[PDB]
UniProtKB/TrEMBL annotation, chains A, J:
SUBUNIT field: Oligomer. Interacts with spike glycoprotein E1. Interacts with spike glycoprotein E2.
Span of the entire protein shown here: 266 to 325 of 1248
Native organism: Chikungunya virus
Origin organism lineage: Viruses, Riboviria, Orthornavirae, Kitrinoviricota, Alsuviricetes
Role description: Acts as a viroporin that participates in virus glycoprotein processing and transport to the plasma membrane, cell permeabilization and budding of viral particles. Disrupts the calcium homeostasis of the cell, probably at the endoplasmic reticulum level. This leads to cytoplasmic calcium elevation. Because of its lipophilic properties, the 6K protein is postulated to influence the selection of lipids that interact with the transmembrane domains of the glycoproteins, which, in turn, affects the deformability of the bilayer required for the extreme curvature that occurs as budding proceeds.
The protein's name in its UniProt record: Structural polyprotein
Places the protein is found: Host Golgi apparatus, Host trans-Golgi network; Host cell membrane; Host cytoplasm; Host endoplasmic reticulum
Disulphide bond pairs: 4-13
UniProtKB/TrEMBL annotation, chain B:
Protein name per UniProt: Structural polyprotein
Locations listed in the record: Host Golgi apparatus, Host trans-Golgi network; Host cell membrane; Host cytoplasm; Host endoplasmic reticulum
Protein source organism: Chikungunya virus
Function: Provides the signal sequence for the translocation of the precursor of protein E3/E2 to the host endoplasmic reticulum. Furin-cleaved E3 remains associated with spike glycoprotein E1 and mediates pH protection of the latter during the transport via the secretory pathway. After virion release from the host cell, the assembly protein E3 is gradually released in the extracellular space. Acts as a viroporin that participates in virus glycoprotein processing and transport to the plasma membrane, cell permeabilization and budding of viral particles. Disrupts the calcium homeostasis of the cell, probably at the endoplasmic reticulum level. This leads to cytoplasmic calcium elevation. Because of its lipophilic properties, the 6K protein is postulated to influence the selection of lipids that interact with the transmembrane domains of the glycoproteins, which, in turn, affects the deformability of the bilayer required for the extreme curvature that occurs as budding proceeds.
Domain of life: Viruses
TrEMBL record, chain C:
Cellular localisation: Host Golgi apparatus, Host trans-Golgi network; Host cell membrane; Host cytoplasm; Host endoplasmic reticulum
Protein name: Structural polyprotein
Quaternary data: Homodimer. Homomultimer. Interacts with host karyopherin KPNA4; this interaction allows the nuclear import of the viral capsid protein. Interacts with spike glycoprotein E2. Interacts with host IRAK1; the interaction leads to inhibition of IRAK1-dependent signaling. The precursor of protein E3/E2 and E1 form a heterodimer shortly after synthesis.
Highest taxon, organism lineage: Viruses
From TrEMBL, chain F:
Subcellular localization(s) per the UniProt record: Host Golgi apparatus, Host trans-Golgi network; Host cell membrane; Host cytoplasm; Host endoplasmic reticulum
Species: Chikungunya virus
Role summary: Provides the signal sequence for the translocation of the precursor of protein E3/E2 to the host endoplasmic reticulum. Furin-cleaved E3 remains associated with spike glycoprotein E1 and mediates pH protection of the latter during the transport via the secretory pathway. After virion release from the host cell, the assembly protein E3 is gradually released in the extracellular space.
Residues of the full protein shown: 540 to 644 of 1248
Lineage: Viruses, Riboviria, Orthornavirae, Kitrinoviricota, Alsuviricetes
Protein name: Structural polyprotein
Highest rank taxon of the organism: Viruses
Assembly behavior: Homodimer. Homomultimer. Interacts with host karyopherin KPNA4; this interaction allows the nuclear import of the viral capsid protein. Interacts with spike glycoprotein E2. Interacts with host IRAK1; the interaction leads to inhibition of IRAK1-dependent signaling.
């Protein structure tokens, strides 16, 4: 299992801290997520879980 | 190349190329682009705009087929060959017909 | 064959043409339906 | 007072997954072959090194 | 100029056509075997090989 | 904002962007006060191997010469011909032809 | 592995020719991509057991809907982006008593040779309080007041019908060989035949000269294994594997080759 | 009034190459090219017919 | 921009305004036009004949046609022995490479 | 004028057994007529009588 890290919390790279569509609630934490877990393709699954996911307003 | 393009009934343009290198065989001692105004006599030849050209053979024949198995509905092991105003040759390699030529489904 | 002057009829209204054009009919490749051949040397283009 | 830092370098491309060329060391080979003997009306063809 | 006259090809569906000798200038004929035809709705022949 | 007594040359509004973002190229520079800061989503459209319908060459005509060969070529476009000896050495030569030539080897 | 279809036993004589039949009209493809993403939707109307169904409107993949009757222009409407989400629903702007009958929504994919259709019964009433949409047990029946619109739903959100990948060019047939005593999964590959034309032969020269598949295989749909000059050492478990991963076709035929009479 | 293609016993159409790499199905397939007109214009022979219904 | 993939539109930034336009407004030439084949995001896969620069053009919402232009010697890699016309009906099969038509890499 | 023969009747070439509107009545007699009698210019006047027929819809 792959675990991401925003420098205080070790949330997994399939569980974002603003689940889901983290940008459309808060942009800057997604930016810090990018700058932190640039090294992770599990973070690319996290952005898959943050962009190509089903938010609270859309069922795609 | 040559490229001739038509357009569909739903306004969908489609090109068509066949590999042919057009060359202009330039005529006389002038090697140019197009007909100018200050010109001189040149006996050339071209296809006239008359329609009544005399007895030129293009082979037209019997229709080969249009294989239309799209309308052959599978009614749970039953092939309802839908015709829809046509004359369908069917080659049923099974029971209930061997071959035939129908107008009704 | 292939030289400018292969196509040979007696009068311009005579259609009895002796000619050697070397049509070796190729096999159309796979599933495509056409008739490829060995290519025909047209003498009458480079007559000019 | 406006200055500007400029930095660049070179790396690989995504072309390198298919587009490349092997510099390669080649020495002594494997003498493999095939022969057909028509032994007594029997065409037997074998292939070995 | 000549005319390379190519008549309409003669697909013998589930059968082997044979050569019709026609006294034509530079006449040439061949029946190709194992062809596959196709059209709008898939194969032009119900025949297979 | 209201700023007391600074003309248009003395003032400078710069709308800092942290929501609305039209992406660009890394030939155009970064922030004027930042070091490393990344955002990483891949690009589409990879490349794959394929095999294409290249043309076949045009068959020319040949005959014997006295321990030589006469060969008349007709090209459709300029193409390379070549030849070699299958003995102890190739002595292979390569040329291009554009028009219809008799070449004797 | 694969879904098996026919398992058979074949006993043949040494020095003869084995023919392990493996043919498929649904794996036929050609060395061209001539409308290999060509799909068609069409709606047909029928009227009971004693009437003939009639084509109303159709649409090709990557194209716009075509109406067959000039009267029906701007009257029969499909969603122009039907191929993005698989929403092939048909809107009739105003219905009448003559519109009653069974409408069929037909999908056809020329590449996988797939066809799927759904039926809806249209019944046109005069009272709006009788207007309902219900399921009769095998099809939706729409009850609509006269002059009201009827949106006949045809939704199939499967990826094969929408413009997702479907550029696979990976029809593949494998001939596999499982020698006696060796268990499966470590089975030796004998032959790979790819839809694009590329071929892979395996083994020492001793085997490659006697094992072949006809050169026009995908043109004629014949992937039969031909074994010339049967030897006792040629016996074993041969397998034909047909794979269309995008449309989910995984079939195999297995032949137990025995050398006897 | 030269109703010239009523008697055209048919070929149910196809195009061998519309361009685009692969094949297609349309009667925009030209059959032959006439070029020998010394002025330089071209007479091209498409398989569809124009003008007359 | 709504975490969706509406294929009819785009965006383009003009003076703090991200403005949108129509998908089908895209017309590219080198000196001769090209083929619009693969269009998503940043990326246009396109087949194009010979030229010496490149200009991509489109039009705005006010019907303002803009064009990017770069002087770049474009030539194809020659494939096979031929210097041919295009792909014919009858050729042979030689391996080459093409940018794949996948959605997301 | 000249007489086209369909191996049963030696009719006039522009006067077939299908006066008027030759192909327009049925296509198959024109099919058989192009099959057998293609050697005749009088049959090409009959082809006119199938092509430039001037039928009841035309004023000539
Ligand atoms: C054997 O092979 C030769 C060529 O090596 C061939 O000419 C001959 O016909 C073959 N005969 C038999 C009986 O296989
Ligand atoms: C499907 O298409 C119909 C066409 O009228 C449209 O009204 C309907 O909203 C569509 N369904 C979805 C889920 O978009």
């Amino acid at each position: 299992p792959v675990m991401c890290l925003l420098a205080n919390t070790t949330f997994p790279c399939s569980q974002p801290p603003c689940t889901p569509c983290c940008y459309e609630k808060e942009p800057e934490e997604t930016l810090r997520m990018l700058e932190d877990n640039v090294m992770r393709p599990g973070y690319y699954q996290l952005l898959q879980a943050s962009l190509t996911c089903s938010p609270h307003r859309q069922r795609r | 190349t040559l490229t001739v393009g038509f357009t569909d009934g739903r306004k969908i343009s489609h090109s068509c190329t066949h590999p042919f290198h057009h060359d202009p065989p330039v005529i006389g001692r002038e090697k140019f682009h197009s007909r100018p105004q200050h010109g001189r006599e040149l006996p050339c030849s071209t296809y006239a705009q008359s329609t009544a050209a005399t007895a030129e053979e293009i082979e037209v024949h019997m229709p080969p087929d249009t294989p239309d198995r799209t309308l052959m509905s599978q009614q749970s092991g039953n092939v309802k060959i839908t015709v829809n105003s046509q004359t369908v040759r069917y080659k049923c390699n099974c029971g209930d017909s061997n071959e035939g030529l129908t107008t009704t489904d | 064959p292939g030289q400018f002057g292969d196509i040979q009829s007696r009068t311009p209204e005579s259609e009895d043409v002796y000619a050697n054009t070397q049509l070796v009919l190729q096999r159309p490749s796979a599933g495509t339906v056409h008739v490829p051949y060995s290519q025909a040397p047209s003498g009458f283009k480079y007559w000019l | 007072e406006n200055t500007q830092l400029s930095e660049a370098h070179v790396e690989k491309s995504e072309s390198c997954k298919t587009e490349f060329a092997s510099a390669y060391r080649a020495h002594t080979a494997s003498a493999s072959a095939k022969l057909r003997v028509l032994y007594q009306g029997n065409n037997v063809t074998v292939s070995a090194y | 100029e000549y005319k390379t006259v190519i008549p309409s090809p003669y697909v013998k569906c589930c059968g082997t056509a044979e050569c019709k000798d026609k006294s034509l200038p530079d006449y040439s004929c061949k029946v190709f075997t194992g062809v596959y035809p196709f059209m709008w709705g898939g194969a032009y022949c119900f025949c297979d090989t | 904002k209201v700023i007391n007594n600074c003309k248009v040359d003395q003032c400078h509004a710069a709308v800092t962007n942290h929501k609305k973002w039209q992406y660009n190229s890394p030939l155009v520079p970064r922030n004027a006060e930042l070091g490393d800061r990344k955002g990483k989503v891949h690009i589409p459209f990879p490349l794959a191997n394929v095999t294409c319908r290249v043309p076949k060459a045009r068959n020319p005509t040949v005959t014997y010469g006295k321990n030589q060969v006469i060969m008349l070529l007709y090209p459709d476009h300029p193409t390379l011909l070549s030849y070699r000896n299958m003995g102890e050495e190739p002595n292979y030569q390569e040329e291009w032809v554009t028009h219809k030539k008799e070449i004797r080897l | 592995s694969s879904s098996l279809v026919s398992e058979s036993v074949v006993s043949l004589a040494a020095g003869t020719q084995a023919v392990l039949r493996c043919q498929s009209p649904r794996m036929v493809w050609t060395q061209d991509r001539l409308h290999d993403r060509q799909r068609v939707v069409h709606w047909d109307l029928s009227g009971g057991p004693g009437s003939q169904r009639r084509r109303l409107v159709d649409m090709y993949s990557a194209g716009e809907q075509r109406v067959y009757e000039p009267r029906d222009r701007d009257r029969l409407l499909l969603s122009p982006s039907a191929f993005h989400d698989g929403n092939f629903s048909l809107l009739i702007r105003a219905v009448d008593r003559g519109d009653e009958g069974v409408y069929t929504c037909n999908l056809h994919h020329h590449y996988c040779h797939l066809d799927e259709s759904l039926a809806v019964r249209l019944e046109v009433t005069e009272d709006p309080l009788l207007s309902r949409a219900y399921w009769d047990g095998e099809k939706e029946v729409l009850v609509v007041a006269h002059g009201a619109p009827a949106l006949m739903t045809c939704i199939n959100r499967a990826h094969v019908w929408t413009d997702r990948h479907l550029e696979e060019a990976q029809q593949v047939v494998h001939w596999d060989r499982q020698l006696p005593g060796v268990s499966h999964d470590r089975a030796d590959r004998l032959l790979d035949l790819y839809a694009s034309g590329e071929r892979r032969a395996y083994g020492p020269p001793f085997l490659r000269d006697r094992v072949s598949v006809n050169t026009n295989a995908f043109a004629r749909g014949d992937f039969s294994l031909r074994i010339d000059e049967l030897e006792r050492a040629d016996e074993g478990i041969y397998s034909c594997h047909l794979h269309h991963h995008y449309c989910g076709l995984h079939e195999r035929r297995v032949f137990h080759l025995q050398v006897t009479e | 009034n030269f109703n010239v293609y009523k008697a055209i016993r048919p070929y149910l159409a196809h195009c061998p190459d519309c361009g685009e790499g692969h094949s297609c199905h349309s009667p925009v397939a030209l059959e032959r090219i006439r070029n020998e007109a010394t002025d330089g214009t071209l007479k091209i022979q498409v398989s569809l017919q124009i003008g007359i219904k | 921009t709504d975490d969706s993939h509406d294929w009819t539109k785009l965006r383009y930034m003009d003076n703090h305004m991200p403005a949108d336009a129509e998908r089908a407004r895209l017309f590219v030439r080198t000196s001769a036009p090209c083929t619009i084949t693969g269009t998503m995001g940043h990326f246009i896969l396109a087949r194009c004949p010979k030229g010496e620069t490149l200009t991509v053009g489109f039009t705005d919402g006010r019907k303002i046609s803009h064009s990017c232009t770069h002087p770049f010697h474009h030539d194809p890699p020659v494939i096979g022995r031929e210097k041919f016309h295009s792909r014919p009906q009858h050729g042979r099969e030689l391996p080459c490479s093409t940018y794949a038509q996948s959605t997301a890499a």
